[PDB]
Amino acid sequence: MNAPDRFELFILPDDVPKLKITPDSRVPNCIIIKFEREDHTLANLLREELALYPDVTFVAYKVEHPLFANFVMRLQTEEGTRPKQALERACASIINKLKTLDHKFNEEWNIKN
Template sequence: MNAPDRFELFILPDGTPKVQNAAIVTFEKEDHTLGNLIRAQLLKDPRVVFAAYKVEHPLFAKFVMRIQTEDGYAPKEALKKACYSLMNQITALENKFRDEWSIATMAQDGESTSRGY
């Protein structure tokens, strides 16, 4: 067949300018759940130009994320900021859940004592 090898489609010819402020990060033992969360959080940052991920094979828990940022803003910093923001959001969600759970538990305890259980 006359088609070039697939790997040649991804190799930049000599002299091609490299993309500035771009990084490719591999996440081992993770899947779409974390990939989509981080991607969505990165895209909320106005200084992130591009963020996407792909799962290379559905049988392996591993994904690759590409991040591109504006000049003067490192992709590593964008990723750290996104992860810290996600951890804060998850902690807030956990606290709200615990508060609601304790209110619901107190309400159930009040009902069971008033019925004489």
């Protein structure tokens, strides 16, 4: 009766952006990212990567409430780099890693069969 639709979990409505960014005033060079229609599948992956970089001071996130499919990510890199640059760097690095993995697996399967 009051059940939420299953198609609302991933199909982002137009009025709200997929990603929303805000600054964190309490400390410098810190921003808060409000994601949408996402869950641990992406947040955890991004966090693990961003934590490995040396120039990133604080990276964190939390799935506020499971009944709502979105999460917020707090990121603060040292003054050297603006957080957004680190974020896009992490995205690119992960994409490259995945492409390499796909190539290797394709080779392995081909020789296997």
